[PDB]
Design a protein around this ligand. Structure first.
Ligand SMILES: NC(=O)c1ccc[n+]([C@@H]2O[C@H](COP(=O)([O-])OP(=O)(O)OC[C@H]3O[C@@H](n4cnc5c(N)ncnc54)[C@H](OP(=O)(O)O)[C@@H]3O)[C@@H](O)[C@H]2O)c1
Ligand SMILES: CCc1nc(N)nc(N)c1OCCCCOc1cccc(CCCC(=O)O)c1
Length: 166
């Protein structure tokens, strides 16, 4: 679908209903169905993440296998074994298809150039708190489809949105 000379930029995240995506340096729920969904969308593509999101990756999947891991940092000496570190967004989006995988800061940074969002909404009532990382706000150019609610094996309810724009 994507012409190979172009640069499709997508954002992928899971959020509570409130928009909270991160808290205390972690994701404040566990949803294996969404872990699998995240792998399914991102596999075989370049993935771009902020340094704090790299830090938060489970050690057994750091770097995330099967994907070119790109970490944004202002720390020139940052050690990200098995990934590459860039100091600006410009050098991070040179691939034909790129998925931005977090966190709050880097979603906001990449949002102007994104034409796809894959959003998991978790039906968990976490009100916004000081310090939370938050999902980006999507303007009126976005459109998309809302999936049906499903229960995870644990009983946590979630649904998938697929957004796109020109
Ligand atoms: N629910 C989800 O889908 C999801 C996904 C990913 C992450 N998370 C969670 O989100 C939280 C992390 O998000 P966050 O907003 O705090 O941090 P982040 O976006 O993951 O990383 C921020 C770091 O990225 C670097 N950075 C940001 N802008 C930059 C720029 N213009 N140029 C160069 N470097 C830049 C800086 O690294 P340096 O400080 O090293 O300079 C900055 O500290 C965690 O809680 C994580 O668990 C949730
Ligand atoms: C899985 C959490 C998550 N979900 C969605 N839909 N989008 C995201 N961007 C996202 O964050 C992923 C990066 C930070 C957390 O990283 C992980 C947390 C738990 C498991 C995994 C491995 C998943 C399987 C794989 O991708 O190989 C990453």
């Amino acid at each position: 679908l994507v012409p190979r000379g172009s640069h499709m930029v997508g954002l992928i995240w899971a959020q509570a209903t409130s928009g909270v995506i991160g808290r205390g340096g972690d994701i404040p729920w566990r949803l294996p169905e969404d872990q699998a969904h995240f792998r399914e969308i991102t596999m075989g593509h370049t993935i771009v993440m902020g340094r704090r999101t790299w830090d938060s990756l489970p050690a057994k999947v750091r770097p995330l296998p099967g994907r070119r891991n790109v970490v944004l940092s202002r720390q020139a000496d940052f050690m990200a074994s098995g990934a590459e570190v860039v100091g600006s967004l410009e050098e991070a989006l040179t691939s034909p298809e790129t998925w931005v995988i977090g966190g709050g800061q880097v979603y906001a940074l990449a949002l102007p150039y994104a034409t796809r969002c894959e959003v998991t909404e978790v039906d968990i009532g976490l009100p916004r708190e000081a310090g939370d990382a938050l999902a980006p706000v999507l303007d009126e150019t976005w459109r998309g489809e809302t999936g049906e609610w499903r229960f995870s094996r644990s009983g946590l309810r979630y649904r998938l949105y697929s957004y796109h724009r020109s």
